[model samples]
Target: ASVQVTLHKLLFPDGQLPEQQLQNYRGLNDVTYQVYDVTDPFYQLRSEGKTVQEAQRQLAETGAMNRKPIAEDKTQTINGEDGVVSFSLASKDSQQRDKAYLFVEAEAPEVVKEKASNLVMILPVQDPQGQSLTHIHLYPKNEENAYDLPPLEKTVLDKQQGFNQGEHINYQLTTQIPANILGYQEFRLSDKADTTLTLLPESIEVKVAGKTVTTGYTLTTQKHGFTLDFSIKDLQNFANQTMTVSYQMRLEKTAEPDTAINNEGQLVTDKHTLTKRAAVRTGGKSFVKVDSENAKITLPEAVFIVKNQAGEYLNETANGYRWQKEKALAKKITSNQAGEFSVKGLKDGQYFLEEISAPKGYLLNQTEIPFTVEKNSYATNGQRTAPLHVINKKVKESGFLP
Candidate 1:
């Protein structure tokens, strides 16, 4: 959704007098514009700089680089409002800055201010001076001081702050609308003209009239495209009853393969872009009509693995190996190996490999790893073989016998 807005004056370059601001001369001098998005659940503050590194430095100073990302949604955009920018938490360096969030959210249907007692509170983590406290606690309305505040509830909680320089702290609250809260509620309209829909990594549990059919399946990319595997319940019920299929499309990483231009046309590698998409279906007379909804995707880091055995987990003693696509072979791959394995842009598919050879004492175990790549991280151990598989098994016969 595009929100028309302008940059605040304080965010402009040369806007701050050197004498008034002194924490970091670099941020004040380098900042070109200050943009804020209150509509988003988290408060987003951008400070454009002359170069990528300069903008990154200012972001670090604001504690944005040291914070953790929100669970459902994340922020993107580099170099103030535009540039060779990267995406990450606003405050990623500070120890106490991990759980903070900048939110300008309200209840779904709206509620009176006083009636928001049970609504989730997004409290600012701060010190006693009311400065943006990164390490403060969340206490109930009738609780003791910082140390005495009660522990946060198990449900999700968030905290967000604006881009202004002053130390005023505020937080947003969110929850399902109470039955009483009602008025002229703000509704978002989908603009089909400007909307773009891309595939994302999402899963849903489908049920019909309280009966679940299938659990779920990890989406895999087709030979030349992408595929989403999900279960459909009570296809027959779509005729008369209005079935309600509720699911959530959480933000996931977008998998985009690198590409280059060729004589034929634009050539793209096997980079699979991962993103989120939601689908809804209503039962028709003979079939269920399906519809897709665009969603924001969240990219996550994959787990790193080296070598191991099948039906076995990797440990300190296991030697890590890599898979070579060109060789179609499993060989020794180490953290420092030059030509080992390539899992960087691996998409979901049926991957095959066989062990070609190994060291003198090590035995080659030809096994296959068949898996479906899902939303989260995954890793597996290599297969193992009997000692007799190797000719050297005779050399160590004297050690043991059967």
Candidate 2:
């Protein structure tokens, strides 16, 4: 009786028929099989129509074939039935074949499934010449799965709410390689700052796994941006490790008041890129103290009105003062018992300070104290301790005494 063999293919994740080109044995042409006998001298047991279990034991003890591959005829036909491909094996000498086993070898199927979730099954079948054959191809969907990409993160180490003009601020970028990733061909980081800010190239520092790495990296600076490239040797050592890059930038004199200076950073690898941003506002504060210029004695209950460059009164709020364009009277600000008052959140500009009222023993300074706030007035600490101090000399009560 002619031996008939059937071949089936199944895809992974979801069981489905593979495409024709993806099929292992779409063509029956140029197919072959090899034969291995279980009753050969390699086995200690003799075959007398023994059970399959006993035959398996005997085959295990005999081990695999040591001879060269067996090649058969290439002629074959496509017998399609029930959507399954079947091939009839050529008959061998009944007596000789009954005591021997047949097998075949062919090139494995080409890897066509390119999804991380895809899987395939390899089925062994007999060719037209009574030889067994099997072939399969499997690979990952993309390099993302094969080579894990590190996640990048960026952060501003300093206060982002505000920055003093010409003050230096620090920024940090960090990323780590996952354990599954390997072999880094390229690792780089880029940082860009607003034109109002100046990049300080000398302040750049790189660290790997918390230890500083001074060599093996190149830094390139531009008008408004900078790039840092890590050597392959450093990246290889960075596998399954965390890397940190920190630098500082100065707020330029051209930085506008109340406007924010934005900074962006990017971490690039061979397979992925990540980016982040930070912003800081430029603002300053003014301090006013009413006291006797001669005796240096504090005088309480002094009232004042603050105005911006346009002469518009700055309305006082709970947090700070804001320019009010309306004709409404600017809120009256009075000095406390300590004879001190302060106005904050003022941008780089000119302002006028007018003392509207003075304490019972003091005279009102009607003259407008004009001052210009330059960009250099702002400090990196977010607050300027040098206050615009104002002193008012106290006067004795003028009266005729009996």
Candidate 3:
């Protein structure tokens, strides 16, 4: 949804001469203007430095329009599309003596980051010498934006190499609370986790303005994801501050070799929603185990240990060897009946498969198998892995199984 913008023609609340106009401001979005005929009743009071909230307190109780002239007013609102909006006005024509002024209230383009400051314009019907008579860009002399789907909001995964089914992944999400947060009825942060993820109920922490707050919202978590919905009253206290949500999700072994874990996050206000994505990719080595002497022979019951470039060996945990560490402390993998054994949850980069021991009849492989994994190792088309053909020689009364 799009926040609305309004153009209000001001009228003097007092008996003032036409020579005087209301002119005061606090940034482009919040300003006070001189008047002729007005719709907002708090104009003059605002000029006296009284804020809207204090004014309400001044009453301390439960208390709580079109006279137009400024030139034939012509206004139109054509909804925005694809986060952009454009409009046109008649070109500068014959200069006139009497000038017209109208106050505008426009919402800045809402984005994940860097809101496009609300637009305010002052058009002179009388053309200045060089001012074009037909077309004029109505923006005030301030700033311009050049972002295409700005990369503002934050979403990140804490673990990648050690991220495997049965492993816990820490996730962090952040977004700046908009200046107009109070205007929206609700502020919600929702996440749609990947199917193979189970959100840990007790692992969620919500923070606003850098401090964690447990009250003021509803947290609903399911097997796949969770949402935190804040009341308008709660958001008002932290408007214009950054909100951070940190949580954890355990990888569910739905797929034996899960390729990737992704989470889609969104921050929502009544008027709009901001989206972001974070990914944790898993990769491993796969090949046919065979006998060194015979190309057609498949070697089963081969034990091996996996290692990364950091000399860290994939370790074992309750989720089945989901951790990685020093080789002196590692778990071993056993080849199945088909001489096929694959390991996942391994991030991209160089890896080593050191054969520890082979079947009772076959001798241990002499050389360690080296393989590599890319970031996209889990993608549909990226499923094809290195074609490592491991081989073992028949033991000739020798005991060298390293």
Candidate 4:
């Protein structure tokens, strides 16, 4: 212990770093180690021609020990004792004609995630071959201990979809492993879609921390988004837990008709930037053959079939509406000339609309119109095209021909 102008504190990344990794560093206790006196003359006219940020803002708001704290009586007789390794405080003699400047952080007030230590050193009581150094070895520069922000989830594919013959759309992005991203210096992530959606850059795939590991991270697609980076670093042995990303999208043949398929995710951090969002929508289906009982009559070829609530049927494929649990290959929808008929791309559970042929002299209803597409959007003139109404009752007037 040097007894004269003491100040010794050491603990670094020398030798295989691991005393439990220095507890991943944390705000050192009670802080405030100011000592400024670089030839005090009332702190040199209050730090005269200030400017290195105005004398460190009065060396931190009017402080020359703030008028009370000359180590405050060595905080009850020298505190921080525990030299089983290296970190003891020894100062209570000073007198080699001073000339100091310590100014470390002053407040912590029970910080939340622990990470504080501001510094400013300037010593040398006497050493340029003049020798008078009593034990001065400070190497400040270590601030770790802060992590909690790594959670984002976005999914598709195994979720559900079917908008206007949508060709492909598969997305998935999950996250975890942030208990201290290797004391991260940076670990970005971003993935937004919906530029009329179309990004299949080889159907991207990456899984970090515990799976995929396609080089851990470093993919930065453009046009409609895609990103994953480890700040372009060879991650230090990566492993704290989870991470996975999936891709593949297409469908925007001019996008419009319920347009809305937002997809979001971001976690770029060095302080903050975490987000999450997901949505999908698109639907279509029309009807109107009127005159169930002559409500102003409006009928035509009326011949339909498109059921799928297990009554599976609607196999008119051309890369759009197709379903099968076997119904002798369904697909026969006809009704026009002022009557109307439409059913392009639909998805969102529950559907049925069977009328199986009935026009020329009407009378073959066999009714079945149970609709509900509140999912893929358009929910006002809703629950079945608002124009919903299909029926005909002509041939029932055979009372000897009216």
Q: Single out the weakest 10-residue window by summed lDDT for candidate 3.
A: 141-150
- Note the clash tally of each candidate: 45, 5, 12, 0
- TM per prediction: 0.17, 0.41, 0.55, 0.35
The TM-score, computed over Cα atoms with residue i paired to residue i, of candidate 1 is 0.17
Q: Model 1 — which ten-residue stretch has the worst lDDT? A: 281-290
Q: For model 1, what is the alpha-carbon lDDT of residue 340?
A: 22
lDDT of each: 0.23, 0.57, 0.55, 0.57
Any idea what lDDT model 3 has? 0.55
Model 4, 71-112: lDDT tens digits are 411111145431111222332225543343433434322222
- Winner on lDDT (2 vs 3): 2
Model 4 scores worst on lDDT over the 10 consecutive residues at 82-91
Ranking by TM-score: 3, 2, 4, 1
Candidate 3 segments exceeding 4 Å error:
1-154, 158-162, 255-258, 307-315, 320-332, 349-351, 365-370, 376-383, 396-402
Candidate 2: residue 255 lDDT (0-100): 62
